[PDB]
Design a binder for these strands. Structure first.
Lengths: 93, 150, 50, 50, 73
RNA sequence: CUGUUGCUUAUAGACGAUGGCAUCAGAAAUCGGUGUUGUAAGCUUUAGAGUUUCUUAAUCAAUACUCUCGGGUAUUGAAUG
RNA sequence: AGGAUUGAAAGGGAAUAAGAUUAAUAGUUCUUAAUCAAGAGAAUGGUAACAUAUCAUGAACUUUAAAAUGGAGUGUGAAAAUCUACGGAAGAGUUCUCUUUUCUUCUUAACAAAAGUAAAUUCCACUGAAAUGAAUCAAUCAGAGAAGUGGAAUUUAUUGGCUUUGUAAGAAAUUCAAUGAAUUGUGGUAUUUUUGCAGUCUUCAUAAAAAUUAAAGGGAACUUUUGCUCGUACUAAUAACCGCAACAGGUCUCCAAGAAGCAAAAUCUUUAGUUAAAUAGAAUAACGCAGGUAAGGGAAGUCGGCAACAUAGCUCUGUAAGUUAGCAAGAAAGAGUAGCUCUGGUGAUUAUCGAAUCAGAACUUUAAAGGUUAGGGG
């Protein structure tokens, strides 16, 4: 299972390296926080992908957490998460 | 200017009530010129007329109650307002009781554990309310089978 | 009503045709005292009873 | 609701000239949320900024 | 509306002169040759694309053939 | 000189009346004093009867002590500055 | 040939649906897809029940059947709604305190087809039941023939009941981009409604007629055309009807979400409708209408417990005189009821899965039906 985050035009607002740390520390698979031993986020530069098949995860979970982070730094107003209908998510204004 | 005509039409076009229609307040001069459905159908695509979402009706409160009632959290004596027969009908506790028993009697007879003459004296015994549950019938069949071989 | 017979619909049609006021040009004749229609009625004032 | 009103409200008013003629003024009672009302006095706010 | 079940009648039906117009819909997996006769509308659901080509050459030139896709005409 | 008007006026009052002040006016908050209720919200006392688990820890857990004589309210017809 | 006319927009009746459109009409218009009527161009199979994309001749006369029929209560098949399990796709809400979280959409007609597959009832063929059996919640049935095995027919909101298929995704719903793009699995031994089936019960009640249609007994001799007349707007009511009116009166029906309970009760909310419906502001006197409370006593008030107060749900124990032996009886009287954490009992398939229901034990508190609904007794 794979899911990607498109940061091609919002990268000025969000540094992609920052999201990498946020996902590994907040994603829960069996119930704890930061237990993303089987899940890798890597870098992928302009995009961010999870592409982990060792855990029971869902596409909508990423949208839940992506919307969760967008409220962490009061960035929800200027952005909006929109799926690209091709196994991934993209951000617009 | 009254926009009653421009709001009723957008209720039929969007297939929603007059309360769910949202006409832009900043575009009153533009909306007020749409006196026909073909004009209203162009405002909706221009997002000057949108459809309000329904009010949220969360069932999270009820689900946690039904989950607690499973463990018997609330099924007390002061939380019952109805008669014992009303909550648990006496007829349907016995309709199911025999269907549980008479199915076992036929299952053993078909299998070959018991014969027609023994299954006949057990059909009426079940019918007379002698065995309270399924467990208390297989024990009696087990008992009456040993007396057979003597 | 929803279901009206033919001889009954044409009589209603005449009772809406007769429920009209004086034409403007008629009142401007000479010695014309017919300024208003006094045989008029309305649906909420007088039921025509028919 | 209609049956209740906040016990204490910390409002802010501003006398401003009207859009049409500057000789006629009008007030605009704003709202200033406050965590607590301890030590809050009737303060005259003056921005004086560019 | 009726449905034909195999190649025997659909090929026979097209050669007959009662046919009014023919429509073909190309779905994701299969294709239906909804020929329109005098009375009903007969359709054959073909899954093998090769067997559709021989069906696409059997229509007489004297009738209107409309090829539909993921967008209605 | 009196009356109106103002303090959405009190020691008065159905309306008038009556009583006080009218720039040393008056009002509004705030801080004290004085009262009413009963210990606020956040986390801690393996307090906590047990269940669940990792498999020999955490999770959930009415209630419950510490901060707490705490929070909230207090003229509206209460009294100071 | 056997008896004339009228008599029902709730009785009988040949045949139509989905999507879209209008400032209003749409089972009436447009697109697509159907159906009916009237025309026009002397047969086989199965032991039997019975069966063959019109087929397979069938006049006079006669008969049978359908149209065609009360109610009560129980059980059950199916669909829809609600609830819910697994897996998701798209969007929306909350987020400094947390929540793999809460919500919305994920649909399909008339008419036809037969991959797969049900419940009930009535019949047929083989054999002939006793040591009597078969079966239902209840019944009920059998040597004028039970049970068993194999078959046949009919009902189950159009063909053939459910899934499935043509219609049909090209429609529609939910999203994205500025006309073009994405998705539309599978379950449930849950509650209600609707519609059928099966037997049971009740009548000194037995609960319509014809048009019209089919069969039997008898043996006399695929295409195309047309479908005329009349109603169709609107309210159907705390403003379109009747009451002298925008009168708190009266007026026959269909559709029906969540919480909670025994309950279509009272109370709150979702889709939908409305914020106006014989004018408002100020002051907060008397006397009022409507709703309340009270020290000590408790009917001494009064024609009279008028009015008001009080008992109230459920579980367990107990329940007198009298009596038409059925009743009195919820007689009277007494005990329990909360919250949290647990345990056990009630089933299907060969450990998994599903239902609200009953019982019991610890610990805590403000010691528990009482917000609403809700017997005063002798």
């Amino acid at each position: 299972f794979s899911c990607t985050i498109d940061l091609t035009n919002c990268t000025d607002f969000i540094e992609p390296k920052k999201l990498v740390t946020f996902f590994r520390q907040t994603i829960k698979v069996q119930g704890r926080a930061g237990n993303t031993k089987g899940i890798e986020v890597k870098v992928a530069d302009k995009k961010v992908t999870i592409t982990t098949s060792s855990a029971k995860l869902c596409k909508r979970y990423m949208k839940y957490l992506m919307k969760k982070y967008l409220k962490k730094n009061n960035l929800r107003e200027w952005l909006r998460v929109i799926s690209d209908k091709k196994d991934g998510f993209e951000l617009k204004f | 200017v009254s926009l009653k005509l421009q709001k009723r039409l957008a209720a039929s076009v969007l297939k929603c009530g007059n309360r769910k229609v949202w006409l832009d307040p900043n575009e009153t001069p533009e909306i007020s010129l749409a006196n026909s459905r073909k004009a209203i159908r162009k405002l909706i695509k221009d997002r000057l007329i949108i459809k309000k979402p329904a009010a949220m009706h969360s069932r999270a409160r009820v689900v946690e109650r039904k989950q607690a009632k499973i463990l018997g959290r609330h099924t007390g004596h002061g939380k019952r307002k109805g008669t014992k027969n009303a909550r648990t009908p006496q007829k349907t506790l016995w309709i199911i009781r025999m269907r549980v028993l008479r199915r076992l009697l036929l299952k053993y007879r078909t299998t070959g554990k018991i014969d027609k003459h023994m299954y006949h004296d057990f059909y009426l015994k079940v019918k007379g309310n002698q065995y309270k549950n399924k467990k208390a019938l297989m024990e009696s069949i087990f008992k009456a089978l040993e007396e057979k071989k003597l | 009503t929803g279901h009206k017979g033919f001889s009954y619909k044409l009589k209603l049609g005449k009772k809406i045709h007769q429920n009209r006021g004086v034409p403007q040009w008629f009142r401007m004749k000479t010695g014309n005292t017919i300024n208003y229609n006094f045989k008029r009625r309305h649906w909420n004032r007088r039921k025509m009873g028919m | 609701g209609i049956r209740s009103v906040a016990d204490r409200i910390r409002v802010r008013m501003a006398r401003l000239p009207i859009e049409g003629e500057e000789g006629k003024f009008y007030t605009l009672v704003s709202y200033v949320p406050v965590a607590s009302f301890k030590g809050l006095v009737t303060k005259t706010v003056e921005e004086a900024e560019n | 509306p009726k449905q034909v079940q195999e190649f025997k009648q659909i090929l026979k039906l097209l050669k007959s002169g009662s046919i009014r117009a023919v429509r073909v819909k190309t779905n994701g997996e299969n294709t239906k040759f909804k020929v329109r006769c005098a009375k009903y509308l007969y359709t054959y659901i073909c899954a093998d694309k090769a067997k559709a080509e021989e069906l696409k050459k059997a229509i007489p030139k004297d009738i209107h053939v409309v090829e539909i896709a993921k967008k209605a005409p």
